[PDB]
Amino acid sequence: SLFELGKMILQETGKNPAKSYGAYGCNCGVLGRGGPKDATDRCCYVHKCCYKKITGCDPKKDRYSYSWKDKTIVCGENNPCLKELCECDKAVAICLRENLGTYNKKYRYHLKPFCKKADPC
Ligand SMILES: CCCCCCCCCCCCCC(=O)O
């Protein structure tokens, strides 16, 4: 659900997920995707595509379990939708941490119809 995802982001990036990522670029994050604005914005774009190939569960609402072991998000699920969900959220979080150096506050509260239409996933 959002709690797990924001936690992962927080734990990986060290940033307040809602602040840094709640409204960042054309895809990070809360209302569809869009021509990524940069590395960070592209992370959320893949995250959404990752979301859409998900079936038995809702990624806003369904909670899953995960572990922090050796400073690594370890998914705790066998359930397929939750495992993939957990893995989509995990990878979004990694990807956001890896691209922090290009993170640009200029796109933090970007207005989202200032966004080009996204390519199908
Ligand atoms: C510290 C607990 C975190 C819960 C707050 C929710 C965080 C939401 C921001 C997640 C950023 C990517 C979201 C998305 O693109 O759907």
Swiss-Prot record:
Keywords: Antibiotic, Antimicrobial, Disulfide bond, Myotoxin, Neurotoxin, Secreted, Toxin. The keyword Secreted applies. The record marks K105, R108 as: Important residue of the cationic membrane-docking site (MDoS). Coiled coil: none annotated. PROSITE patterns: PA2_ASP, PA2_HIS. Disulfide bonds join C26-C115, C28-C44, C43-C95, C49-C121, C50-C88, C57-C81, C75-C86. It is found in: Secreted. One of its GO terms (biological process) is phospholipid metabolic process. InterPro entries: PLipase_A2 (IPR001211), PLipase_A2_Asp_AS (IPR033112), PLipase_A2_dom (IPR016090), PLipase_A2_dom_sf (IPR036444), PLipase_A2_His_AS (IPR033113). One of its GO terms (molecular function) is calcium-dependent phospholipase A2 activity. Expressed by the venom gland. The keyword Secreted applies. Its main location: secreted. One of its GO terms (cellular component) is extracellular region. Residues 105-117 are annotated as: Important for membrane-damaging activities in eukaryotes and bacteria. The record marks L111, F114 as: Hydrophobic membrane-disruption site (MDiS). It comes from the Eukaryota. Heparin inhibits the neuromuscular effect, myotoxin activity and edema-inducing effects. Bromophenacyl bromide (BPB) inhibits the neuromuscular effect, the myotoxin activity and edema-inducing effects. Pfam families: Phospholip_A2_1. Snake venom phospholipase A2 (PLA2) that lacks enzymatic activity. Is myotoxic and displays edema-inducing activity. Displays bactericidal activity and promotes the blockage of the neuromuscular contraction of the chick biventer cervicis muscle. Also disrupts artificial membranes, and provokes tissue damages characterized by edema, necrosis and inflammation. May act as pro-inflammatory mediators, inducing metalloproteinase and cytokine production from the inflammatory and satellite cells. Belongs to the phospholipase A2 family. Group II subfamily. K49 sub-subfamily. Homodimer; non-covalently linked (probable alternative/compact dimer conformation in solution). This is Basic phospholipase A2 homolog BnSP-7. It comes from Bothrops pauloensis (Neuwied's lancehead).
